[PDB]
Design a protein around this ligand. Structure first.
Ligand SMILES: COc1ccc(CCc2nc3cc(-c4c(C)noc4C)ccc3n2C[C@H](C)N2CCOCC2)cc1Cl
Length: 114
């Protein structure tokens, strides 16, 4: 059993560390808006959109029951970006950089919660 405040206290620093990567987090701070970006097939390819602001809101409002659900949303966000974009693209490279920041910080936190 994990209380929402316990999850917020433990996990919010890991999310904030991603936000503090600038410019790498900028594309991830807002939901992808295909109409703004001229990528009309986006929602045909990415079936379950996710972004940092959604994850933040879910942590803030206690929508995770256990911490691996938070990890799942983080990884879904990255998988969506790696899927839609080419390996040579800026957003793919930024995705990878954020994913490495996450990888390095997440286990000490998960180990403490478990
Ligand atoms: C700072 O990094 C960027 C800045 C601009 C671009 C080109 C445009 C773009 N290309 C974008 C690509 C994505 C994206 C993501 C993330 N996953 O699939 C797609 C597509 C999301 C947003 C994207 N955006 C929008 C950017 C970030 N603006 C948001 C509004 O404020 C100014 C900056 C790309 C990048 Cl990687």
């Amino acid at each position: 059993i994990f209380k929402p405040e316990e999850l917020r206290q433990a996990l919010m620093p890991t999310l904030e560390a991603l936000y503090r990567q600038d410019p790498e987090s900028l594309p991830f701070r807002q939901p992808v808006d295909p109409q703004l970006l001229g990528i009309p097939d986006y929602f045909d390819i990415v079936k379950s959109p996710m972004d940092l602001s959604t994850i933040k809101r879910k942590l803030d409002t206690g929508q995770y029951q256990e911490p691996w659900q938070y990890v799942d949303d983080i990884w879904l966000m990255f998988n969506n970006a790696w899927l839609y974009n080419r390996k040579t693209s800026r957003v793919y490279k930024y995705c990878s950089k954020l994913s490495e920041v996450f990888e390095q910080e997440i286990d000490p936190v998960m180990q403490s919660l478990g």
